[PDB]
């Protein structure tokens, strides 16, 4: 329908013939979903606080006959709000309620219960919540937790074979990883013996631990080994035949089967000789004795005549022993298979080498292996075996553990207990014995089917569960202390472990961090992030090979483009636009279902394992109206590769082509043309773009940014929109339409816009109204634009005029050249807001006073500071001026005549009080925004903060009184309506109150009902509004809780306007970023036939050098867009009729071949888009899809329609000399980027200043002093240069020498120009350290 009432102001032109049926998801559902599932109440016991309370509860003391049952929990409303809480600067957290119930059991009496204990809730900890945008609040910070990627718990099939073993064979291993607790792994050695390593401890044989599982050798061999049969009697000595159980043989003699030889001596072992004795029916045959010496007995057979232990299982048989066994009365003997073709003699070396044959000695041996210091006492070994191996608390599998456990073991059951079992680990050892046998496939570590993501829900559940156990220990000891505890859940539960665990977790963690805010882009792509750092997933911070590579599982879920190009590469990832998280943590991406020859519109979400078997067609392919594929052979992918397949082999579809990219790199137009490396660089440079004064929507674009800007939460959107009444920059109100409303409470929705405010990146943010007044608003319309947003469409940079040319060598390599025009148009200018706060107080000499006196300073500061208060709002603070005066007490001294007259003439503070204040260090200057200060508990006698205490009251009463006027006024008009026909009079009612003395009497019913009702809701709304105003005022006058280490906190905002600067930096969307050499005047710029000097000058060499394609098509297509907008602007200058311009606008929309459903003029044709022509008169909003973007045919056809030369090259004349350059020159308009790399912030030039007490070296940068560093490479550079004096006075005089700096400086000021080598003090520090060591050093002459 493409109605787009909110987008009717600017209609972005769409390209490409590939339709998108699946709409863009809300895309924050990872953090929003994780949070809403972290706080929930469900009977199913979903993972969260209820799962933790159900996990730990019931809490029963040891031999205490007392239990604690969980009432679960319910969350309440926080005391503060989002915005007000961030303004106060305190962490935002809701209390927890619904405490657990207790229980008491009678001692020595079974089932006896004196009473049931049900107690009121108790305050425990603080549970932080999430803002609607997906952030958190701690101490007034944004606090977002990065998503994590970890190994999914389950059986791992690993190889670990290669040149690292150097054994000449391929090793194999497998390890079960629980969600918590110790790890259990198996390890091969070249001896081919299965070993067991538990949590890096020395690997014991399999027979000692499996013996600790209480399985005798008979069950070992008879379980994990074959049986068959053996027959010794009558001297025939015959065995059964298993022709289908083995392929192979070794025959040194003939073997006859039923009177005929099946395989002759030395005859071929081939299937011709196999099937001869296989397909035919053959029974047990007699063999010679010599084959027994190689065979191994299976079961345990002992002589029946006497009680010796001879002929034990798992032992070699002796030719002389056959006479002792066969004559003992044993007719049949079970012997092991023991023939190596597809099998091997595993576990035998474990049985032979394993010293412990019993489970008790096995438990003692594994106990001694666990604890080297203390010999085992044999008493706790039984608990160490279960608690170490199979136990409820110390072993955790649950949903993913048992799932990937069974599916990894090829088991039928998909669910089970969260604990290990003997048959389970025996099955793992069996499948591992098969992997060692050579059958079966291994698993890849980088394969995301073995990977799972963890979020705020699972993480916070883990830490909160650990803290809950830490509470369970002390509560268990408390209940075990006393025999009978009445009303136990009162003082037993301490909130310090809870609030310390959750406040320490969200407070300080590697994953939880504050964001540096530049544009909504960095906020949303910083909101969605995958991290392999933190706990797990991190081996080392140096080198690495296979972990940082790209697996085929990285196609439709994680974006290979976006990445931390810095020291750690390939670790931090970004999910796809359409990527979704499964309930078990797996990453599923959409695929459109296809049935027979028609493509069905049903969407199916497939994981890596599910999509591995199915075949999915290429993203871009020919499509027909009937649904069938035009081309017979369609490119399709199955597993790890792609090839042409028939139309019947395609199961699914890739839907949109944007699934492989992320939101950060998906906004870069013409991605298929530009190289992946420079696209990676540009995508890495999209986050650092600082918002400027005014945002101009990109005229070359994608169209995903439309959804990114509205879904980022930065812009101010409207809820249940309607006809707007009042508009303003501070506030916006909307009268809601009466179509869909709740019948109660009446009222309208009010909004408060955020003005200039400091961010974590020291940038500036604001929201501005997009509408004038009286304009209706639908649901989802953006009312106000945030920083770097224009009309709800994301613009984080500014376009400007572009021409490709070297100019007098000023543009070299990637260096950039900017005209003074854009410098003087205020473009690219940004505001940096720094906050300064001086907080000390807390003196044992008495409290500190703020301002009211400035000692040892003239009236210059007293003119800026108020008498009873601080400086005026929006003043000029330059240099070391004192922004806030402060005085601190000093120690008392004797009076004496001197200080007596000094205190008599001085008076007031007596001048003995120190001058320490908030004064700003040098190098910082600007205008102040607002001073928020602070208010303590029970503090008074201060004129400060009174202006904000009154301002918040006048604001809350100002915006709160509007609803009171709408309510009291609406019900008042309802009184004027109900008084009709009861003795009404317009002339009387429109000139008097009470409305006829409360509608008079009339027909009695209206008297008491209408009058008593009018008084009822009249006093109800009046007194209710007054009560709400008082409750709101108390929150304003109560303040916040400051740390005890200060009486009063003062904090001041300051803002600075920084503008396009020569050093600076500038970036493109395709990865080209450079510093500006110099800013040239307008007269020196080349101009076209119309006399339009060029704004920017870049280097064409970077296109072939750095392999950047997209810049050319960007500039040319942008030149076409500004050509259309230039012609429409000319039409507005000519004041043409609506229809004449309407024709060119319609042709502009529908030109080309299809590639859209849009039709101009479709809505009323006389307004809206007709005014949108005057909106886009500056430029045409042309969009291109990521991989579906425009082609040079449509670029040359559109740009040719824009009257511009089809070649995209315009004859230019030199600016300085007026001469024409040889050959045509490429000009265009591209999207540019302002960055935080500006030289005012980066560069600090330091000479001499304060130093460090150790080695007497300077501290470093930002301290106003310091020499940066010239390291050992510079020492080597000077040694190679041959000048030893620069290193002499550089390494010693200007650093270590204490007297060399004073004498050297005295020689520079005096002009002697002489220095001495001196004695380095850092060498003396080495002397002192070694002297502190037990080794003595003393210098000689």
């Amino acid at each position: 329908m493409v109605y787009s009432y909110t987008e009717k102001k600017r209609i972005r032109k769409d390209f490409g013939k590939r339709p998108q049926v699946l709409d863009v998801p809300y895309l924050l559902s990872i953090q929003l979903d994780s949070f809403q599932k972290f706080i929930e109440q469900d009977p199913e016991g979903q993972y969260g606080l209820e799962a933790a309370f159900r996990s730990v509860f019931p809490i029963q003391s040891y031999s205490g006959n007392s239990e604690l049952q969980y009432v679960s929990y319910r969350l309440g409303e926080p005391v503060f709000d989002v915005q007000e809480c961030q303004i106060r600067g305190v962490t935002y957290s809701a209390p927890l309620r619904v405490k657990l119930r207790l229980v008491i059991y009678e001692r020595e009496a079974p089932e006896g219960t004196v009473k049931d204990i049900k107690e009121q809730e108790v305050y425990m900890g603080e549970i932080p919540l999430m803002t609607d945008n997906g952030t958190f609040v701690i101490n007034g910070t944004e606090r977002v937790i990065v998503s994590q990627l970890h190994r999914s718990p389950g059986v791992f099939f690993d190889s670990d074979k290669g040149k690292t073993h150097s054994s000449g064979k391929v090793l194999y291993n497998a390890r079960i990883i629980p969600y918590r607790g110790s790890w259990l792994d198996f390890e091969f050695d070249p001896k081919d013996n299965l070993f067991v390593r538990i949590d890096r401890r020395r690997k014991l044989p399999a027979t000692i631990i499996l013996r600790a599982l209480n399985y005798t050798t008979e069950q070992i061999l008879d379980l994990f080994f074959e049986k068959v049969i053996f027959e010794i009697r009558d001297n025939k000595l015959q065995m059964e035949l298993v022709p289908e159980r083995l392929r192979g043989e070794t025959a040194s003699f003939d073997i006859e089967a039923n009177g005929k030889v099946y395989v002759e001596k030395g005859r071929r072992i081939t299937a011709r000789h196999i099937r001869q004795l296989e397909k035919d029916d053959v029974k047990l045959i007699e063999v010679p004795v010599e084959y027994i010496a190689g065979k191994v007995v299976a079961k345990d057979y002992i002589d029946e005549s006497t009680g010796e232990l001879i002929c034990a299982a798992n032992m070699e048989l002796s030719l002389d022993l056959l006479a002792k066994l066969s004559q003992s009365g044993h007719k049949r003997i079970e012997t092991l298979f023991t023939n190596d073709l597809d099998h091997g003699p595993y576990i035998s070396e474990t049985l032979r080498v394993d010293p412990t044959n019993d489970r008790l000695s096995a438990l003692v041996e594994i106990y001694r292996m666990m604890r080297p210091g203390e010999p085992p006492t044999r008493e706790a070994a039984e608990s160490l075996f279960e608690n170490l191996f199979f136990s409820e608390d110390r072993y955790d599998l649950s949903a993913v553990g048992r799932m990937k456990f069974n599916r990894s073991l090829l088991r039928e059951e998909i669910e089970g207990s969260g604990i290990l079992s003997k048959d389970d680990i025996i099955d793992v050892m069996k499948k591992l014995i098969d992997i060692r046998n050579g059958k079966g496939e291994v698993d890849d570590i980088d394969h995301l089917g073995n990977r799972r993501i963890r979020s705020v829900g699972e993480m916070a559940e883990n830490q909160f569960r650990v803290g809950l156990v830490r509470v369970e220990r002390a509560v268990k000891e408390r209940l075990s202390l006393g025999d009978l505890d009445t009303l136990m859940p009162q003082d037993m539960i301490n909130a310090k472990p809870i609030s310390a665990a959750v406040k320490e977790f969200f407070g300080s963690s590697q994953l939880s961090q504050f964001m540096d805010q530049n544009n909504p882009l960095s906020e949303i792509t910083h909101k969605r992030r995958i991290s392999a750092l933190g706990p797990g997933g991190l081996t080392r911070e140096r080198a690495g090979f296979e972990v940082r590579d790209v697996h085929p599982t990285h196609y439709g879920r994680v974006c290979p483009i976006e990445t931390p190009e810095g020291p750690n590469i390939g670790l931090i990832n970004s999910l796809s636009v359409y990527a979704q998280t499964n309930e078990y943590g797996f990453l599923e991406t959409p695929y459109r279902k296809v049935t027979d020859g028609v493509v069905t519109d049903e969407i199916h979400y497939l994981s890596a394992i599910e999509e591995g078997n199915y075949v999915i067609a290429q993203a871009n392919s020919n499509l027909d109206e009937e649904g069938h594929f035009v081309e017979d052979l369609v490119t399709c992918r199955s597993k790890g590769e792609s090839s042409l397949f028939s139309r019947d082999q395609v199961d699914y579809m890739d839907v949109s082509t944007q699934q492989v990219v992320s939101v950060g790199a998906s906004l870069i137009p013409f991605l298929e043309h530009d190289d992946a490396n420079r696209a990676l660089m540009g995508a890495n440079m999209q986050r650092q773009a600082v918002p400027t004064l005014r945002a101009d929507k990109p005229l070359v674009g994608t169209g995903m940014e439309r959804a990114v800007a509205v879904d980022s939460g930065v812009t101010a959107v409207a809820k249940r929109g309607g006809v707007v009444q009042y508009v303003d920059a501070s506030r916006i109100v909307i009268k809601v339409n009466e179509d869909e409303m709740y019948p109660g409470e009446a009222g309208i929705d009010i909004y408060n816009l955020t003005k200039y405010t400091r961010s974590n990146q020291n940038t500036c943010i604001n929201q501005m109204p997009c509408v004038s007044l009286g304009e209706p608003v639908e649901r989802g319309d953006v009312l106000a634009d945030g920083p770097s947003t224009d009309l709800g469409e994301l613009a984080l940079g500014q376009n400007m005029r572009v021409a490709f040319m070297p100019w007098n060598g000023y543009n070299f390599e990637d260096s950039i050249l900017v005209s003074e025009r854009v410098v003087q148009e205020d473009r690219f200018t940004t505001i940096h807001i720094q906050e300064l706060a001086c907080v000390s107080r807390d003196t044992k000499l008495g409290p500190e006073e703020i301002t009211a006196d400035i000692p040892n300073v003239g009236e210059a500061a007293l003119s800026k500071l108020d008498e009873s208060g601080i400086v005026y709002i929006g003043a000029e603070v330059t240099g070391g001026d004192i922004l806030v005066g402060k005085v601190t007490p000093k120690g008392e001294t004797q009076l004496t005549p001197e200080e007596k007259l000094l205190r008599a003439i001085f008076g007031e503070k007596a001048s003995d009080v120190k001058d320490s204040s908030l004064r700003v260090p040098n190098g910082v200057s600007g205008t102040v925004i607002d001073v928020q200060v602070f208010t303590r508990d029970g503090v008074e006698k201060d004129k400060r903060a009174l202006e904000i205490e009154e301002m918040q009251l006048k604001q809350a009463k100002k915006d709160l009184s509007e609803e009171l006027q709408i309510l009291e006024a609406g019900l008042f008009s309802r009184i004027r309506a109900v008084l009709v026909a009861g003795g009404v009079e317009a002339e009387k009612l429109d000139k008097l109150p009470r409305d006829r003395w409360l509608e008079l009497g009339l027909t009695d019913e209206e008297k008491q009902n209408q009058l008593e009702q009018l008084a009822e809701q009249y006093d109800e709304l009046k007194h209710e509004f007054e009560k709400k105003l008082e409750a709101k005022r108390r929150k304003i006058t109560q303040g916040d809780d400051l740390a005890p280490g200060v009486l009063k906190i003062v904090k001041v905002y300051l803002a600075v306007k920084r503008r396009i600067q020569p050093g600076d930096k500038m970036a493109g969307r395709h990865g080209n970023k450079g510093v500006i050499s110099k800013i040239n005047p307008i007269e020196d710029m080349p101009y076209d036939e119309n006399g339009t000097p060029v704004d920017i000058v870049l280097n064409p060499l970077g296109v072939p050098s750095r392999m950047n394609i997209g810049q050319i098509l960007e500039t040319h297509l942008g030149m076409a867009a500004k050509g259309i907008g230039d012609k429409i602007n000319a039409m507005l200058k000519q004041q043409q009729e609506v229809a004449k311009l309407r024709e060119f606008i319609q042709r502009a929309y529908d030109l080309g071949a299809d590639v859209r459903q849009k039709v101009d003029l479709s809505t009323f044709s006389d307004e809206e888009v007709m005014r949108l022509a005057e909106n886009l008169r500056k430029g045409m909003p042309i969009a291109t899809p990521v991989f579906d973007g425009a082609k040079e045919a449509e670029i040359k056809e559109l740009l040719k329609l824009g009257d511009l030369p089809t070649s995209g090259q315009i004859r230019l004349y030199d600016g300085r000399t007026g001469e024409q350059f040889e050959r045509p020159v490429t000009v265009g308009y591209m999207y540019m980027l302002k960055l935080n790399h500006l030289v005012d912030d980066k560069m600090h030039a330091r000479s001499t200043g304060s130093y460090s007490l150790v080695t007497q070296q300077p501290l470093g940068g930002k301290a106003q002093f310091g020499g940066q560093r010239f390291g050992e490479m510079e020492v080597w550079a000077l040694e190679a240069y041959g000048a030893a004096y620069t290193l002499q006075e550089m390494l010693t005089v200007k650093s270590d020498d204490v007297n060399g700096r004073t004498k050297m400086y005295k020689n520079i000021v005096d002009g002697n120009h002489q220095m001495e080598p001196g004695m380095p003090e850092s060498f003396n520090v080495l002397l002192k350290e070694i002297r502190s060591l037990g080794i003595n050093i003393e210098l000689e002459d």
Binding site: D675, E813, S1207, T1226, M1243, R1269
Partner: protein
């Protein structure tokens, strides 16, 4: 270091004093052997915690987590004492600026922004106000500086002119990373740096920071003017050739300068010398024209201590005639007639330095920069969609290779060909087809363009900017252009083998999704490799630099008769390196001999340079005995005659110069040793008979 408690020290001393006074008190109490034994083990563990911590007990500090610091951590801050001592201290007087490029001013200069000025020079400004006496008291002069008086700027100008400033980039590799320039003030917050030196520092304009240090007084400024100047040291003691980078707009500008064209404008020209001003700047004469009769004067340096003039008519172009005005004096004119790429422009400066001296190649290279940027801007070079050319044979080659591979997989379906031989076979067909698309690409790159004059079949070479960069060599390569138009090749990071699904789409054409997946795969592998090689390179430079620190190079002449024989490598069909570059330099033991005997060419040891060595190139001698290092010489160090004259100064080398520190930076000079490690017979053919 404040809550203070004196961490990492007092935490240990309180425990050790606690156990000492505890064992003394219990010692006076006569505690049992178990109590005093526990006091003795906690005692030895406590003093252990003092001297060496983290080896066994790993005692943790207060806030636990990270083990507490001990004396072992006090000796070595991170690795060794390099942080505290024996390596670079923070020192003083540092700008820490951002790179910019001035095209103007001088090869050795500086753009210390005014903002940067007078902040570092404060002591010299106070002393100047003292000696000159414009101020009264010290605090009054400090007030004159802090009040931003305009009078201070004149004295500041007096100081800055002759006061040099040395510049460095933080990742310093070789000796030329730190140089000495003569600063001049430019309004701004940045530093405009000489473009030719930017590639010498390897620094880029992406915004990497820069270190600015101030030398002090006599040996610093004077040794920096006599040593550390960028023009004083040009020859790099690594490759042996002078290191200058007249690339980018210099190669493009001089390539558009030197070239010919059929017809066009101007035809022939009778005027010769002053044809650039009137002919070029007036009208009627193109910047470059073929068949110009303009005479040109020559200067013959063959005479001893004297230059012999000459004049002759040589076939050339207008742009080459303009370029010859830059070439000083006695250089031959045959050097400027060529395509004049990034290579040919080097040997020009080489022969200029090794004939006319250092000043003519300094002012000459500098003027090469000026004319290169100037005529580069006047060239009007650019790039666009129509600039690149897509060959029409690419479709037939891709279709033919697709048919052949279809027959290959047909043979695999029939079972006649194995999967491995079919795999490598398909790789061979797509490789050969890629070569075909490359050759057709080149054909349409040069011979596609036509110009109509006379018989019209002569035309001319294509003027496209992509081709000017390919042949000129300012940037790009035939392989990168092959990625622009022709096939991109095939690589797989996880597998390490060539994939069976080639990429048939040019950059101008829309790339497939999976093609982009493979491209970002191999690109990510490339970023991992290039990011990985830096640490190993710096570590190798650390090892070799630590091993080579020993050479004093003290004595002048040892006078040893032992030497190493010098013969060419002669590997393969053609020799890899000639005999000249290897034999030149050092000194020769005994003397070389012609086919006639009894005659010696050189008097025992001689310094081999462009004269003597080229005289040896005219003879038939294939082997030259050359005495060098590791052969005899001294007990510690090497005499000057074994190393040779190769250095920034091409004359000789003198006592005291350390070749060990200069060494290891030629091997460790490349930042990236290799990329991908290059993915790692019966007939004998020879080039000549």
């Amino acid at each position: 270091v404040p809550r203070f408690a004196t961490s990492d020290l007092n935490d240990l001393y309180r425990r050790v004093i606690n156990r000492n006074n505890r064992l003394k008190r219990l010692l006076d109490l006569a505690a049992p052997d178990i109590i005093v034994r526990n006091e003795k083990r906690m005692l030895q563990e406590a003093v252990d915690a003092l001297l060496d911590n983290g080896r066994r007990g790993r005692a943790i500090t207060g806030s636990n987590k990270r083990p507490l610091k001990s004396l072992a951590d006090m000796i070595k801050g991170k690795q060794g004492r390099f942080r505290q001592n024996l390596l670079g201290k923070r020192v003083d007087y540092s700008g820490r600026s951002v790179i910019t490029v001035g095209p103007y001013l001088r090869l050795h200069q500086c753009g210390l922004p005014k903002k940067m000025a007078l902040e570092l020079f404060k002591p010299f400004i106070y002393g100047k106000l003292e000696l000159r006496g414009l101020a009264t008291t010290i605090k009054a002069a400090k007030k004159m500086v802090e009040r931003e008086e305009a009078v201070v700027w004149d004295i500041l100008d007096e100081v800055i002119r002759e006061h040099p400033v040395l510049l460095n980039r933080a990742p310093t590799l070789h000796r030329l990373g730190i140089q000495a320039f003569e600063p001049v003030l430019i309004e701004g917050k940045a530093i405009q740096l000489h473009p030719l030196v930017c590639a010498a520092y390897n620094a880029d304009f992406d915004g990497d920071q820069m270190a600015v240090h101030v030398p002090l007084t006599l040996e610093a400024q004077l040794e920096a003017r006599a040593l550390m100047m960028s023009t004083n040291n040009i020859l790099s003691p690594a490759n042996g050739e002078p290191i200058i980078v007249p690339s980018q707009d210099v190669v493009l500008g001089l390539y558009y300068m030197t070239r010919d064209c059929v017809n066009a404008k101007g035809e022939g020209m009778v005027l010769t010398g002053p044809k650039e001003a009137e002919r070029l700047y007036r009208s009627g004469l193109a910047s470059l024209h073929a068949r110009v009769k303009v005479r040109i004067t020559e200067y013959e340096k063959d005479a001893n201590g004297e230059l012999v003039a000459k004049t002759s008519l040589k076939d050339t172009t207008v742009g080459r005639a303009i370029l010859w005005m830059i070439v000083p004096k006695g250089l031959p004119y045959s050097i400027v007639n060529q395509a004049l790429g990034k290579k040919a422009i080097s040997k020009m400066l080489n022969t200029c330095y090794r004939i006319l001296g250092l000043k003519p190649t300094v002012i000459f290279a500098d003027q090469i920069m000026y004319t290169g940027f100037a005529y580069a801007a006047r060239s009007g070079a650019s790039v666009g969609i129509d600039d690149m050319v897509i060959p029409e044979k690419k479709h037939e080659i891709i279709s033919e290779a697709e048919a052949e591979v279809a027959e290959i997989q047909e043979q695999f379906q029939s079972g006649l060909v194995t999967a491995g031989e079919r795999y490598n076979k398909v790789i061979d067909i797509w490789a050969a087809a890629n070569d075909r698309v490359s050759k057709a690409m080149m054909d349409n790159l040069q011979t596609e363009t036509v110009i109509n004059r006379d018989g019209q079949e002569e035309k001319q070479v294509s003027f496209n900017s992509i081709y000017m960069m390919a042949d000129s060599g300012a940037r790009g390569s035939a392989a990168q252009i092959r990625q622009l138009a022709g096939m991109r090749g095939l690589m797989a990071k996880p597998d390490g083998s060539i994939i069976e699904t080639p990429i048939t789409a040019n950059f101008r054409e829309g790339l497939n999704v999976l093609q982009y997946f493979i491209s970002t795969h191999g690109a990510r592998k490339g970023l991992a490799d290039t990011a990985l090689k830096t640490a190993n390179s710096g570590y190798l430079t650390r090892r070799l630099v630590d091993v080579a620190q020993d050479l004093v190079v003290t004595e002048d002449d040892c006078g040893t008769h032992e030497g190493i024989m010098m013969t060419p490598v002669i590997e393969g069909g053609d020799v890899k390196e000639p005999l000249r570059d290897r034999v030149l330099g050092r000194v020769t033991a005994e003397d070389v001999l012609k086919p006639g005997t009894a005659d010696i060419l050189v008097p025992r040891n001689t310094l081999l340079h462009e004269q003597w060595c080229d005289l040896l190139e005219e003879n038939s001698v294939d082997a030259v005995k050359v005495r060098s290092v590791v052969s005899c010489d001294t007990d510690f160090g090497v005499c000057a005659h074994c190393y040779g004259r190769d250095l920034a100064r091409g004359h000789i080398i003198n006592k005291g110069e350390a070749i060990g520190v200069i060494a290891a930076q030629s091997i460790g000079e490349p930042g990236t040793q290799l990329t991908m490690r290059t993915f790692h017979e019966s007939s004998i053919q020879v080039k000549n008979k």
